[PDB]
Design a protein around this ligand. Sequence first.
Ligand code: HEM
Ligand code: HEM
Ligand SMILES: CNCCN(C)c1cncc(CCc2cc(C)cc(N)n2)c1
Ligand SMILES: CNCCN(C)c1cncc(CCc2cc(C)cc(N)n2)c1
Ligand SMILES: C[C@H](O)[C@H](O)[C@H]1CNc2nc(N)[nH]c(=O)c2N1
Ligand SMILES: C[C@H](O)[C@H](O)[C@H]1CNc2nc(N)[nH]c(=O)c2N1
Ligand SMILES: [Zn+2]
Lengths: 407, 411
Amino acid sequence: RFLKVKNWETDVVLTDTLHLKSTLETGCTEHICMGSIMLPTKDQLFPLAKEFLDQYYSSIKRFGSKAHMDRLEEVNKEIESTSTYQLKDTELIYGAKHAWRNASRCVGRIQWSKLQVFDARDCTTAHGMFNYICNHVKYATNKGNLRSAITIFPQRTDGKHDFRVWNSQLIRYAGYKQPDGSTLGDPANVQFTEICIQQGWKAPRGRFDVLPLLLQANGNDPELFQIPPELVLEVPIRHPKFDWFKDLGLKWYGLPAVSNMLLEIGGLEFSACPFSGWYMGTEIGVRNYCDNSRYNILEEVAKKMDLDMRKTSSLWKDQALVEINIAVLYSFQSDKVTIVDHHSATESFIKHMENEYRCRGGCPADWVWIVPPMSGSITPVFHQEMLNYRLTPSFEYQPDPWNTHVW
Amino acid sequence: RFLKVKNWETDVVLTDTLHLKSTLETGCTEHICMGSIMLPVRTKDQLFPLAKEFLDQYYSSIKRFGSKAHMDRLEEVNKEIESTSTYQLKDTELIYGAKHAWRNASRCVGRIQWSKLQVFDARDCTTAHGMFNYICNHVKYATNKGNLRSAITIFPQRTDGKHDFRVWNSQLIRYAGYKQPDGSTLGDPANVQFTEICIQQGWKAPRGRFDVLPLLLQANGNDPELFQIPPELVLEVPIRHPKFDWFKDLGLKWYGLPAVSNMLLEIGGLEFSACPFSGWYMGTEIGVRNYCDNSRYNILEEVAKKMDLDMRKTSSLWKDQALVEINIAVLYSFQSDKVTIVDHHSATESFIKHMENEYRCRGGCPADWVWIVPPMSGSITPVFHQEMLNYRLTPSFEYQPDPWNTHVWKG
Ligand code: HEM
Ligand code: HEM
Ligand SMILES: CNCCN(C)c1cncc(CCc2cc(C)cc(N)n2)c1
Ligand SMILES: CNCCN(C)c1cncc(CCc2cc(C)cc(N)n2)c1
Ligand SMILES: C[C@H](O)[C@H](O)[C@H]1CNc2nc(N)[nH]c(=O)c2N1
Ligand SMILES: C[C@H](O)[C@H](O)[C@H]1CNc2nc(N)[nH]c(=O)c2N1
Ligand SMILES: [Zn+2]
């Protein structure tokens, strides 16, 4: 019941007490581990509020204070009368930071306390949403010196008035099915692209077209907006040694900004809460560029390098992989757009993890997601035992709105 | 109950029913996943159901379930258990059992080969000298002049836990590690403790970087005894690189035969505490882990220096670049010397086919994603994108305590 995690590289052992505050289910049982599975009322509401407010007031060394009791009382009143309650600005900021802190699949959590929270709870229309998102994008981008941010739209009420950003990220490239049977652009975005066209977007049918935002306010029908092109910072990809690399015509956007997740704080649900940080190189170079079901460029790069692609054992894929990832990091650095390599990031996460165990009694971490998609065992996280469990406040997955939306 | 797994690269969905036969625990609960945790004397009471479960499976597998032969065998074992407190497996059951322990090994990417396993029955062995002989024969047969063959040698099962057969080595063939007074390590740091035990037991250490350890063999609960595997039986491969001529001068080699010797084989409730097994290497085991772990030979820097990579910032990915060249070298060297080896692309691709075949024919394939995914180039191998279900089936291979912590010394 008091769990130990061992680092097999360093022999360092940490004791986890924090997991006993866990609440949501893991998908696992004593008979079966689902660790590798990607997606495993007033009565209900007040204990959630209380649990949250208890931890909030503990964090400000005011547990059991009158102001603590007062707040608890006030919230209980409000839930009883109005069936929901409103978070204080302080509570909202605390909650959003802790959702990030609790994100077990995020390697970048050493940064968790430095998050800029934009309160967009006063937003009522999709136009309003668009303005808030432009401001987020511009703030977070900061001319390439990226700053973590989250913009938080009105909370769920009855479920029939949800705010939703239909896009999975604020910034992504379109994907088009060709008559050639092939796929043009990002294959991961074909369906959403269709919905944009369906909703009237005039697609330029290019390879790196920035998708428009599809914004839904107050449970109304979603509307289309185009992010001002001058606010979308992009990095052309070149290689420091290979002059030919630029001829691939590759580029990527600077701002990773997740927009389809649900923020839960104190039992309240924020269905529209886009958040952003900065990229770890492998996200672009390994996954976005080299996944078979993505831009899938390995072969083309390999050919340009004149590798023996006859036999897997020449490790031509591994060689091209490295070079592609070298180019990504080099291109971002050259353009002064913030980026972190997988060595630096995983090293930071180890130190964060030690800080968290020391100051919080633990740190929930999903090893399957934390270990980078290349060079796994030469990063310190590979040798680090981790315990995965769910703490709230939290970011959750939610269904794509087009399967949900009564038009 | 039905469980589905999805491959996120291909969208192929498989349905697992085999997990319904799962037995032992995972370490996980509804509240906590311990999927990345490395390490999560028996009464007649518990024994017969375990025997029975096993024999029902064996008899189903040979399409003789419910047969008189099946029924007589259950009867025979039941009686032998109530008479003698244990029972002996038929040779057929032992072989079936050993193959299935491998088949069930959720951490093994090489399981496409599971039905091809040479089983050496050493249950008649009584002494450490006898164990040495059996192990030499296993090594010679398995090595096969570089054309490696999978094999397992099975020594007598546990009785009261006071007469265990144990191979004290973690692998049949491994290199000594020596801690120096200046705190540096000569040879393989992983094997420092065991090397020290060998030396204390009388082993004369050459004290070089690649000294093959002696066997430390325990028969029938007696104190273990030292034996040197005949050098001519230990196949090794000098590591060179197809393009970089300086790579040979790193002075690296490795042995050809990976042979785990510290695990416990459970079959029908019986416990085989000494059951060394061997196959052939996947390149990354050597090129990534053995050579490049900071806690092992740790050669990344020396290699990267010689390639003259920019080592001033990790962002140059000098470690990644050197890592690849080393793994190219391992594969090159083994192939050149005609010693069996498989790259991580081939091995993971074969595993996916095996896994799918298993779902279709067996109703599932327990697999530990954390172990299955190779330690380099994870997501450009198909296993990375494959959801897996980890559970425990018997017969199985299990961890056991290192014998030096538990052995009662006779003296
Ligand atoms: C500031 C630098 C950051 C870095 C380097 C970073 C890094 C990463 C990486 C590599 C992943 C795996 C993503 C994937 O493979 O798709 C991830 C996931 C995640 N991150 Fe972070 N992140 C950062 C900031 C943030 C922020 C600001 C938040 C929230 C406020 C956040 C919350 C999450 C969540 C919830 C996931 C899981 C996503 C999912 O399950 O799909 N991250 N992060
Ligand atoms: C024939 C070629 C084989 C290949 C290429 C192969 C591949 C692998 C690899 C790469 C690992 C991970 C090792 C590590 O990271 O320490 C492993 C583990 C394992 N293998 Fe296989 N293997 C083979 C044969 C066998 C055989 C013959 C058996 C048993 C009869 C077996 C049973 C196991 C078990 C029980 C593990 C888990 C080891 C542990 O938990 O420490 N394998 N295998
Ligand atoms: C299963 N993933 C497919 C969709 N995808 C590529 C994706 C999913 N989930 C999250 C992200 C972005 C991850 C991320 C987020 C933030 C804030 C920073 C960062 N460096 N990466 C991307
Ligand atoms: C605890 N981890 C380090 C111990 N170690 C190096 C190790 C552990 N477990 C297994 C092996 C050898 C793995 C193996 C076994 C067999 C039969 C074939 C193969 N290719 N690899 C080595
Ligand atoms: C902590 C973590 O479980 C540990 O480093 C594991 C990860 N996956 C592994 N996978 C294999 N094949 N072999 C290993 O030793 C490990 N080590
Ligand atoms: C099946 C498996 O869970 C899936 O491929 C996971 C593996 N680990 C991952 N890790 C990260 N960071 N991101 C991912 O999308 C995935 N995909
Ligand atoms: Zn689990």
